[PDB]
Symmetry: C5
Subunit: 312 residues, 5 copies
């Protein structure tokens, strides 16, 4: 029951790693996802061993639950994980092997700075409660690095799983060596969003620019205002896909720019009508001809500037 005594005068090291089996339910609204995987642990019990038997009497000895096992916990998942022990075995000179399958609901945030073309990083953290004087300093073994189990996440793809680092944890300067970090890097598949959220809005905006080829005030007014109403309705329609956030994003900037363009178009139409009424047709014609070219060029330049600002 008791942990191995500090005979080696060196903290016990526990090599550990996880192996993914199936992950799913990565919703953007609650920043939650489910992970099912297999967790393995190793030991540094080489100086001594409670069962150092090496003869053929007990080949591949397996220990019961009475032997000591480390207790680890995930600091992100709410409630507690469900683990079922499946394999315990002790080799000569200690170094027992302990495998199990678990399930948890990790809590990791997302950064929607580049929502359609963003890359996220899901984090996994675990710690071990120290006992007596010797520490339980953890390490990582690259043989059981994980993944490689044909696991697929819909709407995303996986490029790496561990990139193992050991950041120094800090909690009121507690007596903890470090905390293990597991960073699942993913990328979004953005092709489906182009015909669904991007192109219809551009088509609606381009429809409103046909008012520069007409001289009817009523038709121009109807076109511009009804196009604004249609844009607002489309924004209501696709409000679920767009992320509600307390900071500034790319799509929000695009939408604000579209609103500004609608306002400027209304102003231009009113100015043209007023100039035509006061018997100055040449000025109105010149202004309309200039705007015909000015509007798309300014739109493209502003889009390029935003793309260079929002993506480095």
């Amino acid at each position: 029951v008791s942990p191995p005594p500090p005979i080696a005068d060196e903290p016990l090291t526990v090599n550990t790693g996880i192996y993914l089996i199936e992950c799913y339910s990565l919703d953007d609204k609650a920043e939650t996802f489910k992970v099912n995987a297999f967790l393995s642990l190793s030991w540094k019990d080489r100086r001594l061993a409670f069962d150092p038997v090496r003869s053929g009497v007990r080949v591949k000895t397996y220990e019961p639950e009475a032997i000591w096992i480390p207790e680890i916990r995930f600091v992100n998942v709410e409630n507690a994980r469900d683990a079922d022990v499946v394999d315990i075995s002790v080799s000569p000179d200690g170094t027992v092997q302990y495998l199990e399958r678990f399930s948890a609901r990790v809590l990791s945030p997302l950064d929607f700075r580049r929502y359609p073309f963003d890359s996220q990083t899901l984090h996994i953290y675990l710690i071990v409660r120290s006992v007596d004087t010797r520490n339980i300093v953890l390490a990582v073994d690259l043989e059981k690095v994980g993944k490689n189990d044909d696991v697929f996440l819909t709407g995303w793809d996986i490029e790496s799983f561990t990139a193992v680092v050991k950041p120094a944890n800090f909690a009121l300067e507690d007596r903890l060596e470090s905390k293990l970090d597991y960073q699942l890097r993913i990328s979004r598949q953005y092709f489906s969003y182009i015909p669904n959220i991007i192109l219809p809005m551009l088509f609606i905006l381009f429809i409103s620019w046909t008012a520069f080829w007409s001289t009817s005030y009523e038709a121009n007014v109807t076109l511009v205002v009804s196009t604004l109403i249609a844009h607002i309705a489309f924004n209501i329609l696709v409000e679920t896909n767009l992320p509600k956030t307390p900071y500034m994003t790319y799509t929000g900037a695009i939408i604000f720019m579209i609103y500004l363009f609608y306002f400027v178009a209304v102003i231009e139409v009113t100015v043209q009508h007023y100039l035509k009424v006061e018997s100055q047709p040449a000025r109105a014609a010149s202004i309309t001809r200039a705007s015909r070219i000015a509007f798309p060029v300014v739109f493209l330049l502003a889009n390029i500037i935003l793309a260079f600002l929002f993506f480095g």
Copy 2:
């Protein structure tokens, strides 16, 4: 309590099968459904038997819970199933019969590539934890294949239940023989969707094509833009039935095509008005007469191409 010893030098085989009673609540948003059924198990205990009695002293002997029973689990359902044992009986030469009714919330995904005319396949998986050296390799008996209990699922129909296969499970090259697969094949009843989601959108689109029989710019502009607004409003209305997905589907392609058609109609109306203004009525009349026939033919051809692309 202990499993039968390996006397036959052959892994114990457990014939098993399930019999549906009632299934319901197949919602498309969460990809969840509830299953209540009866699970039966058989044994290969023919080499020996803990109760091999064959005389008339104990006719149709029934075993208590102290005897060993296999432990199986469903890898898809969250939490755990609720099972109530209803019948245990031991025959001569072993071969005990063990029946129960259970309930679970299986987790199976859906593929909405052909949402209105799609066919799904719900999956059931179970495994058995091996004990000692002999394996618990599973099999299937066609006598208890299941279904045939007048079970009905609303909005769908059932064509098959098992199509029994035994895929070789893989989890870090573990020592598991295989995993049982149960595939419930279903098909959707698509008749109700035609008057509810399909025909109104086509009527709205066809309303906008009447602008090719008129020469009033204001009336044409009002017709086309208000029809676009009505289309967006209808899309908002039926957004619950249409499935939100991260890939490309059939209805999404149709909707994008409808948006493109609206844009082209606006462009054509503007071009006709501009040509009429510049004192070229013959060209405008010819363009309108050509478009009157061109638009429906192109729509039909594109629909045929999409139907051949999205259905093989």
Copy 3:
């Protein structure tokens, strides 16, 4: 603890019945409702009795929990019911009385074929697990038939509670005598729906028919298309009351007919304008005068046909 031995050579019969106290929360979206009631049971223990005492030493003897009681379960409610035993008493020649109050969340479907004027039937099912050889065949006593407790359900009314029948249950040809059926018949109060869902839609539709008294193309186009937009907006507004279903209903047929009428009105307006443009005013006037009478008559005839089709 053990059930009465089969001394009478006849299966033990358990007379049973429930008495409603309060039912509520009948939501149409989840097809769920809550029932609180009192359940009573009787016995056929007349051949013998474990406590057949008839003297005045123990007047109105009450048994403890050690005596055997039948175990029943509801096959519709998820999880389990909460029951608190309140009265146990044994009379001469057996025939004990056992009363309790329970609570459950029954699962019963609804058929929205005639949603505004429909009549539903909530179902309650229970079974008893047989022990030994004698059966526990159930029956019903009309004295405790139930209801009659001033219980009111909002939005509905109650006309009957039991209509006691005993359908022969079937589950893989199991050894079960039958299953008790309790059918709570209810009817909906439809008066509130007429001024809320029906009349506004008819008013909107009738507004669009005023275009047959005008000769202005722009006014007619604006009227019809804006009325279509208003109809779609109203349908969005009342989408919660209308039931989402995978089959064909009455309101859905009415809405599809309204869409068809809008399309035909647009076609008629376009035809009239085209005929007037080509210097044929008499034909346009005759067509408009004919349509003025044709539209309401056809609407009424189609409504009558639908009412005779959807209600026998």
Copy 4:
């Protein structure tokens, strides 16, 4: 453990009362609210006493949990309450004092007949399970009547808490004396609703009445139909505040009247245009001048009639 024996030949009376501490979360959709309060109980143990000690050896004696305490339950709250015992003390001649703090989720319905200016009444019910022959008939003490703890409920105000009555409970003519009733009377603060739900709708309706000062058919048609669309959109916007109910309310009647007024306005505009077309301008002018005054007067009279009908 056993209750006091019937020595006085009179049922034991338990004086009881509750003292509010904090109440919150009064949502209109689920008709649920949370109550945290302190519950006190008294006894009629004056004929005898299990601990009738009156000397100075044990001043202010406090009893352990082994002594008998009444068991009460709330018939409205689902699941069960959470109670923590904080004070037990026995005085000379019995009359023990028992205080605790509890929490529950009471289930009380609401009547939205006068939704903006309504007064509700939350109900609390509790009963005691009788033991042996003597009854546990309950009473009320006005000293601990409750409230008076600076408790505030947002959106409402409190005018009374108890108005203590003892209705005679009825459940299959059971042997229960009565049931305690606690009626928390509240009133809604209606000032915030006037600028939020009432005034904008009236402004929208009044906008549509400007069509009686114009002679342009197209402008009148646009005004009336677009105002109808705006009214429907506003109704969609404020659909959460308005209560969905299966009976007739005040706001529903107002909304139906507004729809009727829109229909009559459309009819009047069409009639005026038709009369003007047929070379009868005097009749159209007289009708418009009459309607200018007729519409507001009829609206006001109908509002007064509805206000007298819906409020006695």
Copy 5:
């Protein structure tokens, strides 16, 4: 097990404090947030000590769970907290140290009087149950004041954590010394709301004011009414960000003012048209020219008045 006896004739004082680790999920709809922190406690056990050992036999003695520890509870969080004891140690002359990490779902309300530019204050309350005669009067130590753990809350910022005060709790004049108060002061980051909720509404309102530069009745009517519809649609779009409240706020006043401005604009347009019809063009021109300047000035003055009224 028993608390220290009252040897010092002075109530035992328990110095306490919390140290934040991570807080998240501050949603405005449910007024809920999650707190994970470390709680420390001190003792006044200086007069005596159950383990007053001061020799080197037991250096840094640690007590087991058998020793007495105070029991505290949070009066705001529903259900109960999850605490894991991590450190117990007894020093010479008592003064034990007891640390743990906990988690809870605190219940604190919010005041949306100045929703975009508001400052909230989350509250934490705890009490201790007194035992015997000596009190457990609590205090605060500024060394462990808390925070200072690089904790960040999205959408807000933190300026203070404790501002320690000890309000005198009142509950039916109970025997409780006081209740500890912990006030986490936060401020909202309002920059993102300006381009998302404020500027588009102002642009829509300004679009409607271009009707004062035109003399076409139909164009003015279309502009104003369609702008009103667009404003209602935008209000529907941003209804989630705006807080639903039963009192009067700043944004609600702004929206009501915008509705009033729309109504006045409609009235002005109608008056101008009526005056122009009756052959009084000079009066209409003067009224339009006056309104051109009057509308923005009145809007700005009303905004300034509201800003001075709603912010002191």
